[PDB]
Design a protein around this ligand. Structure first.
Ligand SMILES: N=C(N)SCc1ccccc1Cl
Length: 330
């Protein structure tokens, strides 16, 4: 089997991407944030504290003839911005782009933090990291991909995120029309539960490539590109007036700037992030200071190849017995 679903930016800055997901019988369609940096599929629901729901579409398990309470199971998770959610668990039928999994753990939110409430466009998360990170207790549950994998034509999914435009998540096949040149594959460590890999270096604009190992995660659920302070300083030094602002929380730059590209290495291959992809717009409405899309990972504890990087590539998440990651230009 295979599946194919369009993923769409939630706003004009590509702050996140949502993908429609069918849950239950009859189908209830929710728009979920596919997150290769976590392993829980959770949704706003009829159980979510009413004052914490503001415009999201909710899953109502009592209206699904295939929903079953997973007795005794609870979940609780936090995210990189300090947001969090928690609740109980149902199993139900879940379909993505025509690919169906029966008995998928659907984690129903009883509580969500303010940032989730405040974002009416995201109805929940669909985790695509390794199932070892799943937070359901006392019996850990599998991701949608892990549950689907045995049925898939090939044990892979691909992320093809758009810049200010829709893109595609495919399951079970590689669309050879969706990229240019060849796909370069690179080793993955699953030891921390992430799609963790090592970039071979970087370049800023038309500058020379610096060969250096950068260990990080391929994370569709993180908006920006987080890299070591040395690398990020080298990038922003090429932008007149750019500076790190403690008050804003990262590098900012004059909105009048033309940003240089940023290249990262995948083995002997190179992925070029156009400068425009690194502009996240005014820090507040009407400001002439703009927020940068490349930020320091210092204090995070890990480097993160988030959407800024991934959207410049066609990315293969190869879930074979020994997982790997593939990157192609597009
Ligand atoms: N993608 C996620 N759900 S968490 C990504 C992340 C953010 C900040 C610090 C660590 C991580 Cl893994």
């Amino acid at each position: 089997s295979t599946g194919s679903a369009t993923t769409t930016p939630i706003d004009s800055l590509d702050d996140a991407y949502i993908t429609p997901v069918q849950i239950g019988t009859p189908a209830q369609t929710l728009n979920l944030d596919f997150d290769t940096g976590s392993s829980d599929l959770w949704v706003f629901s009829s159980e979510t504290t009413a004052s914490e729901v503001d415009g999201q579409t909710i899953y109502t398990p009592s209206k699904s003839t295939t929903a079953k309470l997973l007795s005794g199971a609870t979940w609780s998770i936090s995210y990189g911005d300090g947001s969090s959610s928690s609740g109980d668990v149902y199993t139900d039928t879940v379909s993505v782009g025509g690919l169906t999994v029966t008995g998928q753990a659907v984690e129903s939110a009883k509580k969500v933090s303010s940032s989730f409430t405040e974002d009416s466009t995201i109805d929940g998360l669909l985790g695509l990291a390794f199932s070892t990170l799943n937070t359901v207790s006392p019996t850990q549950q599998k991701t949608f991909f892990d549950n689907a994998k045995a049925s898939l034509d090939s044990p892979v999914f691909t992320a093809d995120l758009g810049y200010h435009a829709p893109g595609t998540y495919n399951f079970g096949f590689i669309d050879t029309t969706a990229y240019t040149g060849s796909i370069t594959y690179t080793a993955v460590s699953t030891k921390q539960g992430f799609w963790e890999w090592t970039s071979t270096g970087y370049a800023v604009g038309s500058g020379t490539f610096k060969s250096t190992s950068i260990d990080g995660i391929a994370d569709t659920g993180t908006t920006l590109l987080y890299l070591p302070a040395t690398v990020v300083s080298a990038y922003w030094a090429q932008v007149s007036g750019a500076k790190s602002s403690s008050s804003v929380g990262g590098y900012v730059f004059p909105c009048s700037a033309t940003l240089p590209s940023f290249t990262f290495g995948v083995g002997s291959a190179r992925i070029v992030i156009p400068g425009d992809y690194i502009d996240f717009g005014p820090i507040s409405t009407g400001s002439s200071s703009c927020f940068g899309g490349i930020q320091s990972s210092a204090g995070i504890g890990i480097n993160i190849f988030g959407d800024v990087a991934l959207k410049a590539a066609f990315v293969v998440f190869n879930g074979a017995t020994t997982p790997t990651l593939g990157f192609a230009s597009k």
